[PDB]
Amino acid sequence: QIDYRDVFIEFLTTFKGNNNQNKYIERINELVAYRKKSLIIEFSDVLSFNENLAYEIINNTKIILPILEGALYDHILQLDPTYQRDIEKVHVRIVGIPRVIELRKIRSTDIGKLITIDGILVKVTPVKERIYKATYKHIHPDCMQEFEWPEDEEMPEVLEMPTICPKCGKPGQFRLIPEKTKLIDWQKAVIQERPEEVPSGQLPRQLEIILEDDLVDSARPGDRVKVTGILDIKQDSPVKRGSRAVFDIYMKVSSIEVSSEEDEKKIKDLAKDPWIRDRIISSIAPSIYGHWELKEALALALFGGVPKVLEDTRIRGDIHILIIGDPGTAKSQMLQFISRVAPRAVYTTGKGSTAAGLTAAVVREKGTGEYYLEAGALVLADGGIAVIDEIDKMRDEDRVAIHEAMEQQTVSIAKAGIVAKLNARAAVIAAGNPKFGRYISERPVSDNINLPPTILSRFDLIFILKDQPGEQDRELANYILDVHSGKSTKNIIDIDTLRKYIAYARKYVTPKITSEAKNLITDFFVEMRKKSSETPDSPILITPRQLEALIRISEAYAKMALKAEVTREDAERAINIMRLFLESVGVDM
Amino acid sequence: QIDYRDVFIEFLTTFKGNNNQNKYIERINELVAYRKKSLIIEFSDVLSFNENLAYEIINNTKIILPILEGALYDHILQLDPTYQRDIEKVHVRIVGIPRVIELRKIRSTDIGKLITIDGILVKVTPVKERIYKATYKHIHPDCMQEFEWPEDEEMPEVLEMPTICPKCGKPGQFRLIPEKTKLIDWQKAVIQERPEEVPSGQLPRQLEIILEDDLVDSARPGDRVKVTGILDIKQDSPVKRGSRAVFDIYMKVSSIEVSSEEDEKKIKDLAKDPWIRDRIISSIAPSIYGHWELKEALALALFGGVPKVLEDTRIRGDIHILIIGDPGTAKSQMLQFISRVAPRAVYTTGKGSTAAGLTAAVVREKGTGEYYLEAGALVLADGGIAVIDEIDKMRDEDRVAIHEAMEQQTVSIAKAGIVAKLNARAAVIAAGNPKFGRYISERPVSDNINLPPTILSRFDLIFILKDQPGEQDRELANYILDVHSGKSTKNIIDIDTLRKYIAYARKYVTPKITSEAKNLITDFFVEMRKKSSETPDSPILITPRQLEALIRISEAYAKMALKAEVTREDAERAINIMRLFLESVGVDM
DNA sequence: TTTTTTTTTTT
Ligand SMILES: [Mg+2]
Ligand SMILES: [Mg+2]
Ligand SMILES: [Zn+2]
Ligand SMILES: [Zn+2]
């Protein structure tokens, strides 16, 4: 019953952070600068500053938030009077609630309590409007009266029309007045539980969440998010009894987090090492022995090149990798690692995917009856990585649907009266087997690969893996047994900080090409084309795409070291890795 | 008539177990300590204690369960006052009801009586909430009153709204208040009669069951269960009568069991025998003569290896077996035995299965038009064994769908805008025929097997069965005729005991590899690779998967004897069995 | 009719 409003202001005005800079007065300082009407607090900070204040938010969230928000609004107005007439209400969001419940473990006892759920966002609906205070007109020739229907209370989830006119006490028919109605932004989304917590032999469960006001459009499908709010039962058709007094539960979102300054200097410290490139390469798939050239190639695809956007056209900045090898060469294990270390990645297989599922699918809503598009794997992976294992198992009639997405990075649809064009700027990493399961050295490369030259030319690098039992078997056997015995390689960058390093590099680093790098690349390309003319039977063609592959690879190498320009050293590395690619496919220079 | 609360409390505090250790008091504090809020009792024990009490439970169940629930709650409160305010109700569940009725024999006379049904779980719905006590607000400008609608009575299965406001006596509008409404967990499941119970020439029947409160998520689809509760008629759509006074029936589950200390003593006693491994192998398919190496191989697949989960990757721990042989070599009979003895197994046929049905199917829900996922055979067999007979009859373009699930133990779907990943950690035992029905010795092994090298490398062991007539025919004929004569081989572990032994071993034994075993395994693998390179024509490739097969087989042998370490003896057995596999496919060692 | 995944008969 004690007044907590005064506790809030002294908390906000007076608080010391880890950096000792009064972190919580700059956020409100920027609150009026951009008029975002939303302030973020941490439960750990509120607990340390006042244990009693923290508890009251947890258990009395229903009837403490409007008072707490109202107190903050008065303080903001005192700081700057111009905030008036721009924002009517200011929301404060609480994160870090210790009450974390798994999606499958929610029971009846959790209804009406503030909880947190971690999951995957799978579906988002367009932003709509919800009525919380309506205005009606009594259509009865004596009344012609206006009145806000829900008195001293907001409109519930179910819309209800008055039966007795409050202005005359008589029944009749009432007409809604949209211009005098108060609205609020409304959005619906579906959260799916992570695959880690799914029990054996069961399908993942889903939960419906509601985003309102400024929380709309705060995430995209495929993101991993943490949502905090209040559970409630969902009402859809209360008018129809139809027996079955059984309801589904939904969650009203109060705050959402999508999966800091100390990381920046940690990343900067790593980039200062002259051998950072070797450290990153050694940190790719530590459980796999050997395959150094493959690990280097996979590292480049994670960073990628610099996309170019011009007045008349744009140039792809992503790097595509194709691996062909004998079974058991650990191709799939490295692809699994890539899908975990990448900040955004989608893992698909050749057999378990279709053309519609990879790019875009036309789905007809049975209720309304109209067609609309559904995002495929490549569209959802925009700005990230797409992994396509067992690419050779795809039907050739179905695999050609990704030809334009791999180069033009767009998906074109002309179906069921829908014409659209969606961006699919995603790097593609694929693996497969030769025509006869294992590579046959007694036959030409033409019949071993069994892939059209059109798709081969779209891959920046192609590595052919051969399982040759030699003198390294003992070393390979010892390494594998050490892994099975729990022994772990040391002096490597762990996956968590490695993911942060890649995300930072792809966002703030844009290398530039210098004059000396141009000459090295130009000379090498001429030799590549000249050497290719010697053997025209090979299904590997040296097209102008190969020249742009060198530019992208060179930029990727500089991006690993966080350099702002491409020097001759980065150009030399790009030539070296390209040379190994050519030797694998049988082109020797 | 009389009150049994004193007897019930006395029975719990005075009953004696098998060792007269009062097997019921130590369950009470376990209920208090974990707040499990559900206690079970045995009907045999109650009958053995007081016959009159058992009859009252078995007959007057609907008027004695609340009475015993209240008596139990009071005894808990005095034992521990902290139990209050956390659990407001504790249910007691009675099992072992003598009233057992087949699913097909249920008639109107059994309605309203406590019965028990044994069947197979097929469908489970997500957990929902059911209202048992509602709260309404009369929307009439004079009332603004809140009240609990169902007075001194639980809310029926049909949602009924008040017609006359009790607080004012007038009709009008009533608004539900979710905050004051009381809810209870609710789940719906479907149970099917056992295949051995279905009459000739008819499809199996199904029954709908309801699980509430703590009984939700008590089992997974495909389980074998025994459900006890009260039968009742189902009221689903009472809005319009439409004549048709005919109703279905459904079961309100009171206690459910799936498929102990005395068993543990029996299991541990078996492991003391030095020849337990030989004794176990002799118990595999006792009705099949010969095929000792096959029975040994099948025994290993039942136990499996030790899966390894690391911070960056995971390693398969399951063992896959492939059998190729001439027709009439008892391949199908042995596979049928594995289905019976395995704690969890799924039997499929190559011709009677599809790619979608084996892994996962995307189907369009008719009511809404939205696509959703259906679990395949491999997903349902997670943590168990998947049996695929006539694998050679599968279409090659369709058989490749299981390549991912056999090594990475995952199922990936990218179809119709659905991207998902599912766990399929199951062991695969497959059988089939050579290319020409019977094995042809003139032709090489490559054209006889007629399988791609990719699928072959996935199998830990491959055995080729040749039906060669010889001097052993007389022994085989005598053995078969004795089986038809009713004679049974003795000194073999019965199937029920063997199933318990395997389940215990797979749950509590995690063998570790010693230094001595590492040296033996490494030497053999190096030797295998050298021999393979000498004859680069066989369809079997010695990939690094073969090295991991040796580790998995070694752990299985140790796990068979409930050993915590892999000594050198287990390594020699693993090497020896692999030698027989290599000689079967014509690879000399 | 229309796109989609699926098992099925029949174009
Ligand atoms: Mg693979
Ligand atoms: Mg057979
Ligand atoms: Zn009026
Ligand atoms: Zn009233």
From Swiss-Prot, chains A, B:
GO terms for biological process: DNA replication. A motif (Arginine finger) lies at residues 457-460. Signal peptide: none annotated. This is Minichromosome maintenance protein MCM. Presumptive replicative helicase. Has ATPase and DNA helicase activities. The latter preferentially melts 5'-tailed oligonucleotides and is stimulated by the SSB protein (single-stranded DNA binding protein). The active ATPase sites in the MCM ring are formed through the interaction surfaces of two neighboring subunits such that a critical structure of a conserved arginine finger motif is provided in trans relative to the ATP-binding site of the Walker A box of the adjacent subunit. Changing K351E: Loss of helicase and reduction of ATPase activity. PROSITE patterns: MCM_2. The lineage of its organism: Archaea, Thermoproteota, Thermoprotei, Sulfolobales, Sulfolobaceae. GO terms for molecular function: ATP binding; ATP hydrolysis activity; helicase activity; identical protein binding; single-stranded DNA binding. The gene is MCM. The keyword Transcription does not apply. Changing K331A: Loss of helicase and ATPase activity. Belongs to the MCM family. It catalyses: ATP + H2O = ADP + phosphate + H(+). The keyword ATP-binding applies. GO terms for cellular component: MCM complex. Keywords: ATP-binding, DNA replication, DNA-binding, Helicase, Hydrolase, Nucleotide-binding. It comes from Saccharolobus solfataricus (strain ATCC 35092 / DSM 1617 / JCM 11322 / P2). ATP binds at G325, D326, P327, G328, T329, A330, K331, S332.
